[PDB]
Design a protein that fits this description.
CATH topology: Ubiquitin-like (UB roll)
Subcellular location: Nucleus; Nucleus, Nucleoplasm; Cytoplasm
CATH class: Alpha Beta
CATH architecture: Roll
GO cellular component, one term: nucleus
Family: Belongs to the TTC4 family.
Number of strands: 9
Protein name: Tetratricopeptide repeat protein 4
Distance between the termini: 32 Å
Function: May act as a co-chaperone for HSP90AB1. Promotes Sendai virus (SeV)-induced host cell innate immune responses.
Order of helices and strands: HEHEEEHEEHEEHE
Radius of gyration: 16 Å
Number of domains: 1
Shape: globular
Helix content: 10-25%
Length: about 150
Amino acid sequence: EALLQAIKARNIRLSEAAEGLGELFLDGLSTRLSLDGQGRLSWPVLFLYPEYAQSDFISAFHEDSRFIDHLMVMFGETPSWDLEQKYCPDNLEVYFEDEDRAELYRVPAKSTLLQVLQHQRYFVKALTPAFLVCVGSSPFCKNFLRGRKVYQIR
């Protein structure tokens, strides 16, 4: 169907497919992503906050939208769990894991979703891109990145 074709057209890697059984499974799943009138993709996206074991679900993250623009809106108000009141958009860092190699990639907040999904080591799970969000200078961020190779995407 349209959705899986649109994903492959963007050279985005899916964890279930990368026999064709994975593709068949994913085709079945896809038939929460949506296409614009101009053929542009919006994704359901999870932000995970591993400091407090919390998460936010963004229902329609447009592929051409920037992380910072979402973070500015989401962290306008302080969430109840932000005890030190330190989750300010300016100080937030966004990461994803390359699980097979046990390496982390930092995502500049001005990046678009499409730019990150097209990274060679980004693999989408359950058709739902996920990102780890934490405070740059914080004690937890120090501990979470401890003993891990940390790169930054272009």
